[PDB]
Amino acid sequence: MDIKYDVVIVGSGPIGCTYARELVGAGYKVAMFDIGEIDSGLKIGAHKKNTVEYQKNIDKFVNVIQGQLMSVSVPVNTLVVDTLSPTSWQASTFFVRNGSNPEQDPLRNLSGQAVTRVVGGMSTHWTCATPRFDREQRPLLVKDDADADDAEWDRLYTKAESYFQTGTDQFKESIRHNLVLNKLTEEYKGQRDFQQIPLAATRRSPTFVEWSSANTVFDLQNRPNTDAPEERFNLFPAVACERVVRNALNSEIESLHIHDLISGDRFEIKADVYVLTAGAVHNTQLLVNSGFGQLGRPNPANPPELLPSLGSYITEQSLVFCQTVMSTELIDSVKSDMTIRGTPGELTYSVTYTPGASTNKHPDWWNEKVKNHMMQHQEDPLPIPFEDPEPQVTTLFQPSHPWHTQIGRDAFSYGAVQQSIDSRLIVDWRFFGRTEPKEENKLWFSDKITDAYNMPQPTFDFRFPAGRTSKEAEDMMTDMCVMSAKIGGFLPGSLPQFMEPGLVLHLGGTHRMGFDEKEDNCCVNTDSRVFGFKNLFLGGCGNIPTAYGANPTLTAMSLAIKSCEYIKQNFTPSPF
Amino acid sequence: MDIKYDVVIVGSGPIGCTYARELVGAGYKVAMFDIGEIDSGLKIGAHKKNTVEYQKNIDKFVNVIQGQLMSVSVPVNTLVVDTLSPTSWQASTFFVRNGSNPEQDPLRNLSGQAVTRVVGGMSTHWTCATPRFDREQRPLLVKDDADADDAEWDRLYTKAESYFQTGTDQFKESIRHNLVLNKLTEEYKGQRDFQQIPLAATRRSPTFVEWSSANTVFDLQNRPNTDAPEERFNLFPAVACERVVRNALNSEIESLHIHDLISGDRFEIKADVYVLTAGAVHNTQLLVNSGFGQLGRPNPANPPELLPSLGSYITEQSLVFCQTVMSTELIDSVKSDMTIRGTPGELTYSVTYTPGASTNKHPDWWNEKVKNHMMQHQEDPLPIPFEDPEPQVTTLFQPSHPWHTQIGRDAFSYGAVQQSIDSRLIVDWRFFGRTEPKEENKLWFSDKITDAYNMPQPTFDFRFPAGRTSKEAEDMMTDMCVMSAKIGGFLPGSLPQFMEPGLVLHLGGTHRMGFDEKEDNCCVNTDSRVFGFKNLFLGGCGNIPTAYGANPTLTAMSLAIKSCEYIKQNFTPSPF
Amino acid sequence: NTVEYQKNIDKFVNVIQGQLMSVSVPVNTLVVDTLSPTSWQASTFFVRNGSNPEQDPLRNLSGQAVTRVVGGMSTHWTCATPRFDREQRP
Amino acid sequence: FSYGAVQQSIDSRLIVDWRFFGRTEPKEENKLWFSDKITDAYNMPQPTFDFRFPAGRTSKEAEDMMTDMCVMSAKIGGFLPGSLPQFMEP
Ligand SMILES: *Cc1cc2c(cc1C)Nc1c([nH]c(=O)[nH]c1=O)N2C[C@H](O)[C@H](O)[C@H](O)COP(=O)(O)OP(=O)(O)OC[C@H]1O[C@@H](n2cnc3c(N)ncnc32)[C@H](O)[C@@H]1O
Ligand SMILES: *Cc1cc2c(cc1C)Nc1c([nH]c(=O)[nH]c1=O)N2C[C@H](O)[C@H](O)[C@H](O)COP(=O)(O)OP(=O)(O)OC[C@H]1O[C@@H](n2cnc3c(N)ncnc32)[C@H](O)[C@@H]1O
Ligand SMILES: *Cc1cc2c(cc1C)Nc1c([nH]c(=O)[nH]c1=O)N2C[C@H](O)[C@H](O)[C@H](O)COP(=O)(O)OP(=O)(O)OC[C@H]1O[C@@H](n2cnc3c(N)ncnc32)[C@H](O)[C@@H]1O
Ligand SMILES: OC[C@H]1O[C@@H](O)[C@H](O)[C@@H](F)[C@@H]1O
Ligand SMILES: OC[C@H]1O[C@@H](O)[C@H](O)[C@@H](F)[C@@H]1O
């Protein structure tokens, strides 16, 4: 570890790796710090789902997710256990136990919100859905020129899509995918468009998908190295970043204070530029720990000196969920083009079809897979091949259906996985609603209570705003119930429900972007630069100030590409 | 990858790595293949619990375990779901579905048995308890001379313990550990002795333990390298070993058939010595796929050509579990030496002790920690410090209580982790019974059903033997009830129970060791060589032919060490 | 004492549960945070569904209950009638 | 008076219940009192408890009793999963 770098990035998720990729490639001496460790295989910060074992045992991956999602704010527990032995030590009060937060009102929380501390961040476990936001969900980069605004966003998105390797044909020859996609397309013909979820992923084989991650964006190997001899990069895992030091004039950051978790020692790191990409919650924590905003329960009677909007206007999406069991009619349609020569198991059994026949309801790639399945496996009563990938269908947010949708199978299952019903029959439904930014909705940090890293404990003051947010959320639920029924009935144990506020992990607006600090109620400008400070930048979903339904990561990445263009224009790399 | 090695080892668990450590050390050219991949970070095959984050959020680690335990044999599911929508597709039978094994009798299973496919094997997640077996539990390595047998075991264990870095001092200054240990010592005074569970681990810091693993035994780095420029070792991950090829006379192995899972390519690898350390289930799977023992449902009318005892006499331990909530008396005794005045939270409150007083119940370090906790956290009603490590207590197996005991906190929790009761109060109790080896208890492999790697599907025919094993399992239950009540009453949700057969993962005797193939009904000799074959060696818990209650891994290692002594005596390494 | 209850012994528990009314039920503080945003939800754990705001949940006899029928609890009891020995007896 | 769902996979002929009842020391501090403001379903003052099992002999005996039940019951059989040894609600 050196003492001085051109650039220092806090956090090694995909947004920090965006800044790494742009600035390391542009010749800056870059240091990156993460509080978590390299745990993930030889490809540093790669997707954990990319092993042969998780791709043969994809029901198990939920365990990896759960194992690295740690709850942000757990209210004091009031459950009554009144069947302890009389000899056992027993509480007189509901006192603060097990890491809980006494500042947290249980009824105004985002109880599902969680954070991940591993190199690569949450991109080590994510679903990889990278849709663009349309105008209605997206903040303005240009004022007073819609066409120019769209042009700027299209340029940033096309880059971001390239970094992530976003694509929309990786599931094109999945039977289950097309079964679902075709039925919904038909059902909403002239009303709604359905397509594959855009995915940051590259298919390698018919049974393997290489899912994208922070590693894809930047490979996180220290530099110079053989393949990049003139670049300069160091990653320092197990380093808790604690405070950015402000000059007295509140115009420049002078250092970053770090705590090495292995040695236990503390250090002051100097940079020309400081970039915080520690996620929506922890970027906010790090700033409040540094004198930005207001530490403690909000007190309107005392304006903070800096960033009064910090941690207000936070948004989290409502999420509805269910699973369906494929209708008999749809399953029968899978085998419609087949010729079935008699009784299964017995000599009188050929399964054939006519390639290219114009009476055929399905393509030839579909019939050949069904044929070979029905012939290699004549005990099995379903026409869906055993290896066939899950659907990945969406109809994107529009004004007449203002929610995002993901239809298929997500690795994050929410209950014990059922085993009685054949898995090929099961389709998940997740609808995601947008939340109006409101000043009263707040993430703040205690001035007494601390977390397991000794930083001020985060505390939420959150309710879904009345009015449109709440109206839409319920309309969204009914839409899921109506649409899902076209495919099949609900699976008992996965009936239509709202998920725990915040489980969806799409928290935005904790350090929101705008043109003007005061009139837009924001903390950073459209360069992601913190108002008043020359050399401090913030990256991630915390930047997004709008009400959005779709998954925010590609959009945060686009914003980070723009911020890097500013940094490149205003700071010069040190000589090599 | 070469065609030709001195030694090939199949499996990179800690037994594999014992063979590599000995043979790579002695100058042999070694290759190891593992079906799974590297994913413990830059330390290949290291313990996944060695992150600062896991050791701060101890509850979370069970997810990692559950993530990489895949059930060996799941019977066909016959759960009735009769609340499907009438439009959903439903079969009219309980057909073979979702990977289940139609060979498996649900009533004669080890349903909790499971395997792990990752470089470092189960040592990447284990508990690291490494006790010796006493004579009663241990196979003979020398007959008719008890002193020479004790001497050989002592030598081999001692060597095993240096490999794993086993110790009994890492929890010595935990208040909770000492509280439980002292009370148990006092209560059974001169009927039973208690001590710390011997653990393969080194404490780094008051709040961090470096848990040992395969990596501790052998770092798994390709050699030659700057640290070992004369050594020759290559690891090949993502390689499924499928068959060993026998010569016509069944006196030697001629090659190893493998399948590179990333590329799809198949190869036959040549070696002088072939070592199988694929685990108790998979070593057997591979032998049977190579024409040892018998494929398919056991048929005593058709004797096997080779190794007639392969897969019979299997043992797996009974396990009984509860948790307790610490007694008021025990908790009050934590502060026995303190003078407490005034009222918590007021400026008049104080807590003090008399250092060195010979009438103090506890040592100065105890009293200092309690004092600082009670003075700094006057809102907390417990005298135990917040990061006190957990208890790690055992009373080892003896003839008058012939079960192993582990008292404390295990990372493998079995239910939802409860939050109402302060974790500082909770003590886990696991007692492990020994199971008599019986011929009728079998692991066999289907001749038609294959597993997710297209190998013969494992199937169990198992029941705890009547007579001694059963009598002891139920006496062991009563023993856990009786001892645990000395410390406190049962935690609701964790009441005294037998765990699922095989959940404990101490399967033994699948390829058991003995002096004589016929008279001892076994598969390998005391050099772990397969009878008949000059150059084929098996390693692991599969070898242990006795009824044991203690954790087997250290014992299997000690056998691997002896095996390597035989290899050094009978094969010469190739010149560098 | 019906032929049906002594043929279906498992079912009589329902009769017992049906006439045991809880004596003191503390205010409920279970958190249900998966309601639709359009549903009415109050801001506190207010006194709801017949609960008793005087009751400390941690110093209760939560299982205690009463029966208001002619014959009282002798309409459902187990009928066990031991004598007390001296130690137990006033 | 069964306490949970009735299990149907184990033949009811095998199943034996165990209930052990401890004695509780009478203590002035254990009280049943009635609210001067809250009323029950029949317009009468709401009953409220302030109870804990007394430390000392009551509590020691109760734990000794739970242990005795684990010891005695094992002479007849192992525990039925779902009805493991437990204290019931006060
Ligand atoms: C967990 C989850 C998340 C997402 C999906 C599903 C699952 C189950 N699916 C997904 C999501 N995003 C979408 O756009 N599409 C989808 O299909 N998920 C969210 C996505 O995963 C995040 O939006 C994205 O990674 C966030 O990127 P980031 O801003 O770079 O933040 P990360 O949380 O990934 O990484 C931050 C990082 O910094 C570290 N850290 C935290 N505090 C410190 C301090 N104080 N010092 C140093 N380092 C710090 C963390 O350790 C972490 O790596
Ligand atoms: C999972 C677990 C295990 C243990 C404890 C707790 C938990 C939850 N605690 C524990 C253990 N044992 C102890 O003595 N002490 C305790 O405190 N656990 C058991 C222990 O972990 C095992 O006994 C030990 O690893 C076995 O060592 P091994 O014989 O080297 O076998 P592994 O299963 O670790 O590794 C074998 C290995 O080979 C691979 N494989 C499997 N099949 C193939 C084929 N066909 N080709 C190539 N490679 C193969 C695996 O992927 C694996 O790595
Ligand atoms: C419910 C139950 C009870 C017993 C056991 C099993 C179960 C599930 N088994 C048991 C019993 N006791 C035995 O010694 N051995 C066993 O094997 N149980 C308890 C027993 O049932 C009670 O001890 C007994 O009936 C008490 O008799 P009681 O003192 O006569 O009181 P009851 O509660 O039976 O009847 C009182 C009664 O008067 C009424 N009432 C209440 N308030 C008013 C007012 N304000 N005005 C007029 N009447 C009032 C009730 O309606 C009731 O009928
Ligand atoms: O809860 C899982 C969901 O998590 C969200 O964070 C993702 O963006 C979705 F893709 C995913 O379906
Ligand atoms: O199931 C957990 C148990 O697993 C067994 O494999 C271990 O040996 C114990 F150490 C551990 O407590």
PDB file of N, CA and C and ligand atoms in Angstrom, chain A residues 10-16 33-36 65 69 116-123 125-130 239-241 277-279 282 286 406 412 505-506 539-541 551-554, ligand 1:
ATOM      1  N   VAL A  10     -14.002   3.648  -3.218  1.00  0.00           N
ATOM      2  CA  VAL A  10     -14.423   2.909  -2.065  1.00  0.00           C
ATOM      3  C   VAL A  10     -15.510   2.059  -2.574  1.00  0.00           C
ATOM      4  N   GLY A  11     -15.242   0.759  -2.607  1.00  0.00           N
ATOM      5  CA  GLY A  11     -16.272  -0.244  -2.952  1.00  0.00           C
ATOM      6  C   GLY A  11     -15.933  -0.878  -4.254  1.00  0.00           C
ATOM      7  N   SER A  12     -16.060  -2.185  -4.310  1.00  0.00           N
ATOM      8  CA  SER A  12     -15.733  -2.937  -5.489  1.00  0.00           C
ATOM      9  C   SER A  12     -16.905  -3.629  -6.181  1.00  0.00           C
ATOM     10  N   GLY A  13     -18.097  -3.084  -6.016  1.00  0.00           N
ATOM     11  CA  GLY A  13     -19.238  -3.523  -6.829  1.00  0.00           C
ATOM     12  C   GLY A  13     -19.087  -3.031  -8.263  1.00  0.00           C
ATOM     13  N   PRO A  14     -20.107  -3.299  -9.067  1.00  0.00           N
ATOM     14  CA  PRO A  14     -20.045  -2.972 -10.459  1.00  0.00           C
ATOM     15  C   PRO A  14     -19.937  -1.490 -10.787  1.00  0.00           C
ATOM     16  N   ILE A  15     -20.379  -0.618  -9.874  1.00  0.00           N
ATOM     17  CA  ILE A  15     -20.285   0.841 -10.116  1.00  0.00           C
ATOM     18  C   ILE A  15     -18.851   1.329  -9.809  1.00  0.00           C
ATOM     19  N   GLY A  16     -18.268   0.901  -8.716  1.00  0.00           N
ATOM     20  CA  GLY A  16     -16.838   1.156  -8.546  1.00  0.00           C
ATOM     21  C   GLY A  16     -15.918   0.606  -9.668  1.00  0.00           C
ATOM     22  N   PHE A  33     -10.709   0.063  -2.477  1.00  0.00           N
ATOM     23  CA  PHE A  33     -10.802  -0.482  -1.143  1.00  0.00           C
ATOM     24  C   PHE A  33     -12.146  -1.103  -0.958  1.00  0.00           C
ATOM     25  N   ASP A  34     -12.178  -2.294  -0.392  1.00  0.00           N
ATOM     26  CA  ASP A  34     -13.442  -2.908  -0.083  1.00  0.00           C
ATOM     27  C   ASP A  34     -13.398  -3.502   1.331  1.00  0.00           C
ATOM     28  N   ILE A  35     -14.522  -3.464   2.018  1.00  0.00           N
ATOM     29  CA  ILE A  35     -14.571  -3.873   3.353  1.00  0.00           C
ATOM     30  C   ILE A  35     -14.610  -5.423   3.369  1.00  0.00           C
ATOM     31  N   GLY A  36     -15.038  -6.003   2.265  1.00  0.00           N
ATOM     32  CA  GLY A  36     -15.145  -7.456   2.182  1.00  0.00           C
ATOM     33  C   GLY A  36     -13.990  -8.070   1.470  1.00  0.00           C
ATOM     34  N   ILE A  65     -27.161 -16.376  -1.758  1.00  0.00           N
ATOM     35  CA  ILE A  65     -27.691 -15.024  -1.666  1.00  0.00           C
ATOM     36  C   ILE A  65     -27.906 -14.694  -0.182  1.00  0.00           C
ATOM     37  N   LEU A  69     -26.461 -11.489   2.434  1.00  0.00           N
ATOM     38  CA  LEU A  69     -27.342 -10.340   2.541  1.00  0.00           C
ATOM     39  C   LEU A  69     -27.569 -10.123   4.038  1.00  0.00           C
ATOM     40  N   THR A 116     -24.329  -6.307   1.256  1.00  0.00           N
ATOM     41  CA  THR A 116     -23.441  -7.402   0.958  1.00  0.00           C
ATOM     42  C   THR A 116     -22.051  -6.847   1.034  1.00  0.00           C
ATOM     43  N   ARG A 117     -21.145  -7.506   1.742  1.00  0.00           N
ATOM     44  CA  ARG A 117     -19.763  -7.020   1.894  1.00  0.00           C
ATOM     45  C   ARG A 117     -18.841  -8.166   1.409  1.00  0.00           C
ATOM     46  N   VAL A 118     -18.603  -8.183   0.107  1.00  0.00           N
ATOM     47  CA  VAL A 118     -17.684  -9.112  -0.576  1.00  0.00           C
ATOM     48  C   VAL A 118     -17.146  -8.337  -1.794  1.00  0.00           C
ATOM     49  N   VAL A 119     -15.957  -8.712  -2.222  1.00  0.00           N
ATOM     50  CA  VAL A 119     -15.389  -8.077  -3.408  1.00  0.00           C
ATOM     51  C   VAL A 119     -16.273  -8.415  -4.631  1.00  0.00           C
ATOM     52  N   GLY A 120     -16.636  -7.384  -5.384  1.00  0.00           N
ATOM     53  CA  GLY A 120     -17.677  -7.516  -6.386  1.00  0.00           C
ATOM     54  C   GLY A 120     -19.094  -7.151  -5.899  1.00  0.00           C
ATOM     55  N   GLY A 121     -19.237  -6.960  -4.598  1.00  0.00           N
ATOM     56  CA  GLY A 121     -20.571  -6.566  -4.055  1.00  0.00           C
ATOM     57  C   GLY A 121     -21.670  -7.477  -4.461  1.00  0.00           C
ATOM     58  N   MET A 122     -22.816  -6.873  -4.730  1.00  0.00           N
ATOM     59  CA  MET A 122     -24.007  -7.656  -5.006  1.00  0.00           C
ATOM     60  C   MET A 122     -23.989  -8.237  -6.405  1.00  0.00           C
ATOM     61  N   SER A 123     -23.019  -7.852  -7.246  1.00  0.00           N
ATOM     62  CA  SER A 123     -22.944  -8.385  -8.617  1.00  0.00           C
ATOM     63  C   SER A 123     -22.393  -9.776  -8.574  1.00  0.00           C
ATOM     64  N   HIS A 125     -23.950 -12.089  -6.845  1.00  0.00           N
ATOM     65  CA  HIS A 125     -25.141 -12.883  -6.705  1.00  0.00           C
ATOM     66  C   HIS A 125     -26.357 -12.421  -7.527  1.00  0.00           C
ATOM     67  N   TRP A 126     -26.269 -11.275  -8.196  1.00  0.00           N
ATOM     68  CA  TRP A 126     -27.465 -10.623  -8.830  1.00  0.00           C
ATOM     69  C   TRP A 126     -28.137 -11.409  -9.932  1.00  0.00           C
ATOM     70  N   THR A 127     -29.341 -11.019 -10.269  1.00  0.00           N
ATOM     71  CA  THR A 127     -30.088 -11.649 -11.370  1.00  0.00           C
ATOM     72  C   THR A 127     -29.679 -11.207 -12.779  1.00  0.00           C
ATOM     73  N   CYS A 128     -28.954 -10.076 -12.922  1.00  0.00           N
ATOM     74  CA  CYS A 128     -28.369  -9.608 -14.193  1.00  0.00           C
ATOM     75  C   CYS A 128     -29.343  -8.922 -15.101  1.00  0.00           C
ATOM     76  N   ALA A 129     -30.542  -8.570 -14.632  1.00  0.00           N
ATOM     77  CA  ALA A 129     -31.537  -7.912 -15.459  1.00  0.00           C
ATOM     78  C   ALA A 129     -31.089  -6.430 -15.582  1.00  0.00           C
ATOM     79  N   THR A 130     -30.820  -5.996 -16.812  1.00  0.00           N
ATOM     80  CA  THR A 130     -30.346  -4.660 -17.123  1.00  0.00           C
ATOM     81  C   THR A 130     -31.212  -3.941 -18.160  1.00  0.00           C
ATOM     82  N   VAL A 239     -10.706  -3.865   3.941  1.00  0.00           N
ATOM     83  CA  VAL A 239     -10.433  -2.501   4.359  1.00  0.00           C
ATOM     84  C   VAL A 239     -11.721  -1.695   4.437  1.00  0.00           C
ATOM     85  N   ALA A 240     -12.093  -1.367   5.673  1.00  0.00           N
ATOM     86  CA  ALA A 240     -13.245  -0.574   6.007  1.00  0.00           C
ATOM     87  C   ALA A 240     -12.898   0.860   5.800  1.00  0.00           C
ATOM     88  N   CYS A 241     -13.607   1.521   4.897  1.00  0.00           N
ATOM     89  CA  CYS A 241     -13.406   2.919   4.712  1.00  0.00           C
ATOM     90  C   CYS A 241     -14.354   3.650   5.696  1.00  0.00           C
ATOM     91  N   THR A 277     -18.437   4.421  -3.920  1.00  0.00           N
ATOM     92  CA  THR A 277     -19.355   3.511  -4.565  1.00  0.00           C
ATOM     93  C   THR A 277     -19.599   2.296  -3.609  1.00  0.00           C
ATOM     94  N   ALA A 278     -20.009   2.631  -2.373  1.00  0.00           N
ATOM     95  CA  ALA A 278     -20.150   1.647  -1.303  1.00  0.00           C
ATOM     96  C   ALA A 278     -21.613   1.172  -1.170  1.00  0.00           C
ATOM     97  N   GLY A 279     -22.430   1.530  -2.181  1.00  0.00           N
ATOM     98  CA  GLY A 279     -23.887   1.217  -2.244  1.00  0.00           C
ATOM     99  C   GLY A 279     -24.727   2.342  -1.600  1.00  0.00           C
ATOM    100  N   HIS A 282     -24.486   2.497   2.451  1.00  0.00           N
ATOM    101  CA  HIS A 282     -23.188   2.814   3.002  1.00  0.00           C
ATOM    102  C   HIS A 282     -22.462   3.991   2.478  1.00  0.00           C
ATOM    103  N   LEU A 286     -21.111   6.624   5.254  1.00  0.00           N
ATOM    104  CA  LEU A 286     -19.758   7.165   5.171  1.00  0.00           C
ATOM    105  C   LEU A 286     -19.823   8.741   5.160  1.00  0.00           C
ATOM    106  N   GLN A 406     -40.905  -9.324 -14.319  1.00  0.00           N
ATOM    107  CA  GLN A 406     -40.003 -10.415 -14.559  1.00  0.00           C
ATOM    108  C   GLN A 406     -40.732 -11.727 -14.286  1.00  0.00           C
ATOM    109  N   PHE A 412     -33.411 -16.105  -6.318  1.00  0.00           N
ATOM    110  CA  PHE A 412     -33.855 -15.700  -5.014  1.00  0.00           C
ATOM    111  C   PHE A 412     -35.288 -16.170  -4.713  1.00  0.00           C
ATOM    112  N   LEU A 505     -34.356  -4.655  -2.791  1.00  0.00           N
ATOM    113  CA  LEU A 505     -32.997  -4.078  -2.868  1.00  0.00           C
ATOM    114  C   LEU A 505     -32.761  -3.127  -4.021  1.00  0.00           C
ATOM    115  N   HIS A 506     -33.698  -2.270  -4.271  1.00  0.00           N
ATOM    116  CA  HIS A 506     -33.583  -1.300  -5.361  1.00  0.00           C
ATOM    117  C   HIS A 506     -33.706   0.085  -4.842  1.00  0.00           C
ATOM    118  N   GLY A 539     -21.157   7.330  -6.539  1.00  0.00           N
ATOM    119  CA  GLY A 539     -21.714   6.466  -7.532  1.00  0.00           C
ATOM    120  C   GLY A 539     -22.727   5.499  -6.960  1.00  0.00           C
ATOM    121  N   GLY A 540     -23.798   5.241  -7.744  1.00  0.00           N
ATOM    122  CA  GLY A 540     -24.710   4.157  -7.568  1.00  0.00           C
ATOM    123  C   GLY A 540     -26.137   4.589  -7.546  1.00  0.00           C
ATOM    124  N   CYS A 541     -27.000   3.610  -7.309  1.00  0.00           N
ATOM    125  CA  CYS A 541     -28.462   3.843  -7.233  1.00  0.00           C
ATOM    126  C   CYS A 541     -28.854   4.984  -6.288  1.00  0.00           C
ATOM    127  N   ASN A 551     -35.011  -2.284 -12.962  1.00  0.00           N
ATOM    128  CA  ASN A 551     -33.800  -2.489 -12.129  1.00  0.00           C
ATOM    129  C   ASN A 551     -32.799  -1.383 -12.436  1.00  0.00           C
ATOM    130  N   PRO A 552     -32.232  -0.760 -11.416  1.00  0.00           N
ATOM    131  CA  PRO A 552     -31.576   0.533 -11.539  1.00  0.00           C
ATOM    132  C   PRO A 552     -30.066   0.400 -11.925  1.00  0.00           C
ATOM    133  N   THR A 553     -29.466  -0.785 -11.808  1.00  0.00           N
ATOM    134  CA  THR A 553     -28.025  -0.828 -11.939  1.00  0.00           C
ATOM    135  C   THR A 553     -27.467  -0.299 -13.273  1.00  0.00           C
ATOM    136  N   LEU A 554     -28.017  -0.712 -14.418  1.00  0.00           N
ATOM    137  CA  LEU A 554     -27.482  -0.172 -15.685  1.00  0.00           C
ATOM    138  C   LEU A 554     -27.501   1.351 -15.745  1.00  0.00           C
TER     139      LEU A 554
HETATM  140  C1  LIG E   1     -28.585  -9.176  -3.923  1.00  0.00           C
HETATM  141  C2  LIG E   1     -29.480  -8.959  -5.152  1.00  0.00           C
HETATM  142  C3  LIG E   1     -29.206  -7.797  -5.903  1.00  0.00           C
HETATM  143  C4  LIG E   1     -29.685  -7.571  -7.189  1.00  0.00           C
HETATM  144  C5  LIG E   1     -30.387  -8.585  -7.832  1.00  0.00           C
HETATM  145  C6  LIG E   1     -30.804  -9.676  -7.062  1.00  0.00           C
HETATM  146  C7  LIG E   1     -30.139  -9.999  -5.846  1.00  0.00           C
HETATM  147  C8  LIG E   1     -30.787 -11.145  -5.183  1.00  0.00           C
HETATM  148  N1  LIG E   1     -30.796  -8.470  -9.194  1.00  0.00           N
HETATM  149  C9  LIG E   1     -30.445  -7.381  -9.898  1.00  0.00           C
HETATM  150  C10 LIG E   1     -30.080  -6.264  -9.186  1.00  0.00           C
HETATM  151  N2  LIG E   1     -29.788  -5.147  -9.905  1.00  0.00           N
HETATM  152  C11 LIG E   1     -30.308  -4.918 -11.075  1.00  0.00           C
HETATM  153  O1  LIG E   1     -29.980  -3.867 -11.708  1.00  0.00           O
HETATM  154  N3  LIG E   1     -30.642  -6.090 -11.663  1.00  0.00           N
HETATM  155  C12 LIG E   1     -30.930  -7.343 -11.330  1.00  0.00           C
HETATM  156  O2  LIG E   1     -31.372  -8.391 -11.883  1.00  0.00           O
HETATM  157  N4  LIG E   1     -29.542  -6.352  -7.916  1.00  0.00           N
HETATM  158  C13 LIG E   1     -28.885  -5.125  -7.385  1.00  0.00           C
HETATM  159  C14 LIG E   1     -27.451  -4.887  -7.824  1.00  0.00           C
HETATM  160  O3  LIG E   1     -26.736  -6.020  -7.415  1.00  0.00           O
HETATM  161  C15 LIG E   1     -26.944  -3.583  -7.258  1.00  0.00           C
HETATM  162  O4  LIG E   1     -27.814  -2.522  -7.711  1.00  0.00           O
HETATM  163  C16 LIG E   1     -25.491  -3.266  -7.630  1.00  0.00           C
HETATM  164  O5  LIG E   1     -24.608  -4.369  -7.360  1.00  0.00           O
HETATM  165  C17 LIG E   1     -25.053  -2.123  -6.746  1.00  0.00           C
HETATM  166  O6  LIG E   1     -23.816  -1.719  -7.251  1.00  0.00           O
HETATM  167  P1  LIG E   1     -22.857  -0.878  -6.319  1.00  0.00           P
HETATM  168  O7  LIG E   1     -23.359   0.537  -6.188  1.00  0.00           O
HETATM  169  O8  LIG E   1     -21.481  -0.980  -6.997  1.00  0.00           O
HETATM  170  O9  LIG E   1     -22.946  -1.495  -4.817  1.00  0.00           O
HETATM  171  P2  LIG E   1     -22.654  -2.930  -4.201  1.00  0.00           P
HETATM  172  O10 LIG E   1     -23.551  -3.023  -3.048  1.00  0.00           O
HETATM  173  O11 LIG E   1     -22.691  -4.060  -5.210  1.00  0.00           O
HETATM  174  O12 LIG E   1     -21.161  -2.831  -3.792  1.00  0.00           O
HETATM  175  C18 LIG E   1     -20.738  -1.871  -2.802  1.00  0.00           C
HETATM  176  C19 LIG E   1     -19.524  -2.399  -2.114  1.00  0.00           C
HETATM  177  O13 LIG E   1     -18.797  -1.525  -1.284  1.00  0.00           O
HETATM  178  C20 LIG E   1     -18.496  -2.280  -0.125  1.00  0.00           C
HETATM  179  N5  LIG E   1     -18.415  -1.438   1.063  1.00  0.00           N
HETATM  180  C21 LIG E   1     -19.512  -1.101   1.675  1.00  0.00           C
HETATM  181  N6  LIG E   1     -19.147  -0.248   2.655  1.00  0.00           N
HETATM  182  C22 LIG E   1     -17.752  -0.088   2.540  1.00  0.00           C
HETATM  183  C23 LIG E   1     -16.859   0.630   3.264  1.00  0.00           C
HETATM  184  N7  LIG E   1     -17.304   1.419   4.259  1.00  0.00           N
HETATM  185  N8  LIG E   1     -15.530   0.597   2.847  1.00  0.00           N
HETATM  186  C24 LIG E   1     -15.086  -0.166   1.788  1.00  0.00           C
HETATM  187  N9  LIG E   1     -16.017  -0.891   1.131  1.00  0.00           N
HETATM  188  C25 LIG E   1     -17.311  -0.787   1.461  1.00  0.00           C
HETATM  189  C26 LIG E   1     -19.085  -3.677  -0.179  1.00  0.00           C
HETATM  190  O14 LIG E   1     -18.305  -4.618   0.465  1.00  0.00           O
HETATM  191  C27 LIG E   1     -19.416  -3.810  -1.612  1.00  0.00           C
HETATM  192  O15 LIG E   1     -18.675  -4.712  -2.375  1.00  0.00           O
END
